[PDB]
Each structure stands twice: as structure tokens, then as C-alpha cells.
Design an enzyme around this catalytic site. Structure first.
Site, PDB file in Angstrom:
ATOM      1  N   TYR B  95       0.682  -0.941  -0.084  1.00 35.45           N
ATOM      2  CA  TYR B  95       0.134  -0.377  -0.137  1.00 35.45           C
ATOM      3  C   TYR B  95       0.557   1.060   0.181  1.00 35.45           C
ATOM      4  O   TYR B  95       0.481   2.314  -0.586  1.00 35.45           O
ATOM      5  CB  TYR B  95      -1.323  -0.141   0.977  1.00 35.45           C
ATOM      6  CG  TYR B  95      -2.090  -1.077   0.942  1.00 35.45           C
ATOM      7  CD1 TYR B  95      -2.040  -2.311   1.194  1.00 35.45           C
ATOM      8  CD2 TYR B  95      -3.422  -0.369   0.003  1.00 35.45           C
ATOM      9  CE1 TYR B  95      -3.676  -3.200   1.100  1.00 35.45           C
ATOM     10  CE2 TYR B  95      -4.741  -0.972   0.450  1.00 35.45           C
ATOM     11  CZ  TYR B  95      -4.348  -2.699   0.593  1.00 35.45           C
ATOM     12  OH  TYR B  95      -5.361  -3.213   0.235  1.00 35.45           O
ATOM     13  N   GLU B 137      -8.915  -7.099   4.343  1.00 35.50           N
ATOM     14  CA  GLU B 137      -8.254  -7.892   4.243  1.00 35.50           C
ATOM     15  C   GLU B 137      -7.309  -8.886   4.742  1.00 35.50           C
ATOM     16  O   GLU B 137      -7.422 -10.062   5.052  1.00 35.50           O
ATOM     17  CB  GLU B 137      -7.097  -7.506   3.176  1.00 35.50           C
ATOM     18  CG  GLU B 137      -7.594  -6.961   1.905  1.00 35.50           C
ATOM     19  CD  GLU B 137      -6.651  -6.435   0.846  1.00 35.50           C
ATOM     20  OE1 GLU B 137      -5.986  -5.462   1.387  1.00 35.50           O
ATOM     21  OE2 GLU B 137      -8.372  -4.759   0.859  1.00 35.50           O
TER      22      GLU B 137
END
Ligand code: HEM
Ligand code: HEM
Lengths: 146, 146
Positions: B95, B137
Site C-alpha cells: 500500500y 484484508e
């Protein structure tokens, strides 16, 4: 982050908790100092009114929860408290203890009005609120050492 | 969490970014695959339209940012994407790479319209959005192994 269904549960039950607010916060404070005596020294243990600080702790959680969809509007309050937390040496690892005892007090006082679904929602709300404090405090701690 | 001042900056600049939206997302996609070729295999590298997936990635970040004060309303979209992310093996450590390249693309395309204050605000917004994905997630990954 909370999902909408959870937010709706908090919205619907905050007034029930506030109707029992003094009893919840007083029970929280008593249980916290009786079951986790290691936190006592962090507070001001003046002889008479030694419960006023942890009662205000719990009351502010309830107030933040009623404001859970506009936490940015209360961030300046969170920051002022964070400075006090950092000066008292509050650690991230304290926050699950406080959450456990607050959820316990809510169930103890509300009885059968605090269903599993309601307690689960309050547990999730507490986690979101605590995460904001933990992050602000982590940054403040890092500023003071670097 | 964002403070109100930062939220106001996002609100004021989302339309500038959307006016340049195709150019931002296309630049992001090109830069991502050129500077981090290790992510290529995770996507569908069909000969012609190999940029459509990472363009949609960037466009969805911009869409989530325009909705940054009601992320609970888009959590069902986040969960659908998370399933795809988990099936592709997207990790928390990916990310910051994506955020870096998206901020780079915004500056590359907007030029002097993307001030330091504006870029800082978009960086903070990206972090809040990414944190939701990472948490969803992480839980999904834990369900599949336990
Ligand atoms: C979880 C969210 C929390 C909130 C909203 C919160 C809120 C507050 C507030 C409003 C005060 C000021 C009390 C007053 O002066 O009347 C306070 C003080 C304090 N709290 Fe927290 N608290 C939280 C978590 C904690 C935790 C986990 C601890 C760990 C023991 C803690 C320990 C303390 C201490 C030691 C003080 C010092 C009393 C003072 O200087 O006023 N708080 N907290
Ligand atoms: C930061 C917030 C992110 C958002 C809002 C987002 C959004 C999306 C969306 C909407 C899709 C579906 C694309 C489509 O089918 O048209 C997607 C797919 C995908 N994304 Fe993400 N993404 C994010 C982060 C990432 C990250 C960090 C990676 C790491 C490489 C990533 C890798 C992928 C991959 C491999 C797919 C598979 C394509 C597919 O099955 O559609 N995404 N993402």
C-alpha cells in the site's frame, strides 16, 4: 471502522446508556480499581473523591460514541486528553483493559437490556475511539524522544 | 483519521483532480508498472489493455476520497475489492508503493496546482482509505488459514 448496521445500534442505544450514566461510570471506576489495582497510581488518589477521574474517563467514551460519525469535530478534545495521557504514561496496552471493564460495567448495570448484539457494537465503537487516542499518543511520544 | 482542515482541502480539490482524472490514472498506471515491475504479475497483462486495472485502482482511490466522510456507505464496495486483493495476494506492504506513485502522478499531472499542502492532504486521505482495506484484508486472510 464501523459498518452502518453497527452505527445504527450505537445510535439507538446511546440514550439508554446515558439514562444509566452515573451508575455505569461509577461501576466502571470501582471495578477498574478493584480488578486492575496496577492502574491506581496513574490517577490522583485523593482520599474522598478518588473515583471522579475514572468516572470522567468512562463518561467521555460514551460522549465520543454518541459523536462516532463526527470524530473530526472532537479531535481537538482528543488531543488535549492525549497530552495528559502521555504525561501519565498511558500505553497502548492499557486500552483493552479499560474497554473490557467498560463493557463489563455496561452489562452489569443494564442487565438484560444489554444484549450480545448491543455489547458487540459497543465493543467495536470503543475500538475505533481507542485507535484515535493510541495514534495521537504514539506521535506525541515520538516527538518527545527523537 | 483526518482533521477538519485536511477534509476541507480534499473537498476543495477533488474536482480539480477529477477534471484531470484520465490523465492522473493513466500516468499512475504507467509509472507503477515502469518503476515497480514486480507488481505486474499480480494483474492481467493482456497485450492491448494492460493499463485498465491499475487505472481503475487509482480512479477508485479518488472516488473513495470524495466519499471520505462516509466510508461506511462504501464498505460493501471495499469488501468486494478486498476479496479480489486477497485472491491476488496483495499485502499491507504494497500500500505505501501505490500511495507513493499515486501522489507522484497527481503532482506530475497537476503541476503547480498541486501544492505541498494539497499533496500532504491527499497523502493523509490515502492512508485512511488504505487502512480500511488493510484491516478487512487482514481479517479475510486470518479466516482462510485458521
Ligand atoms: C479509551 C478512551 C479514553 C478516553 C475517552 C479517556 C478520557 C479521559 C478524560 C476525559 C480524562 C480527563 C479526566 C478529568 O480530568 O476529568 C482522562 C484522564 C486520564 N485518563 Fe483517560 N481516557 C481513555 C482511556 C484511558 C486509558 C486506557 C487510561 C489508562 C489507564 C486512561 C487513564 C487516564 C489517566 C491516568 C488520566 C489522568 C487524570 C487527569 O489528569 O485528569 N484513560 N481520560
Ligand atoms: C489503496 C487503495 C486501493 C483501492 C481503492 C483499490 C481498488 C481496486 C479496484 C476497484 C480494483 C478492481 C479493478 C477492476 O476490476 O476494474 C482493484 C483490483 C486490483 N488491485 Fe487494488 N486498490 C487499492 C490498492 C491496491 C494495492 C495496494 C494493490 C497492490 C498491487 C492493488 C492491486 C490490485 C490487483 C492485483 C487487482 C486485480 C485486478 C482485478 O481482479 O480486477 N490494489 N483494486
Amino acid at each position: 471502522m464501523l459498518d452502518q448496521q453497527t452505527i445504527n445500534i450505537i445510535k439507538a442505544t446511546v440514550p439508554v446508556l446515558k439514562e444509566h450514566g452515573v451508575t455505569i461510570t461509577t461501576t466502571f471506576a470501582k471495578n477498574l480499581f478493584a480488578k486492575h489495582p496496577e492502574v491506581r497510581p496513574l490517577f490522583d488518589m485523593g482520599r474522598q473523591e478518588s473515583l471522579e477521574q475514572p468516572k470522567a474517563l468512562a463518561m467521555t467514551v460514551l460522549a465520543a460514541a454518541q459523536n462516532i460519525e463526527n470524530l473530526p469535530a472532537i479531535l481537538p478534545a482528543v488531543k488535549k486528553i492525549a497530552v495528559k495521557h502521555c504525561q501519565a504514561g498511558v500505553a497502548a496496552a492499557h486500552y483493552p483493559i479499560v474497554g473490557q471493564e467498560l463493557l463489563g460495567a455496561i452489562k452489569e448495570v443494564l442487565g438484560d437490556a444489554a444484549t450480545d448484539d448491543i455489547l458487540d457494537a459497543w465493543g467495536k465503537a470503543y475500538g475505533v475511539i481507542a485507535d484515535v487516542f493510541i495514534q495521537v499518543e504514539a506521535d506525541l511520544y515520538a516527538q518527545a524522544v527523537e
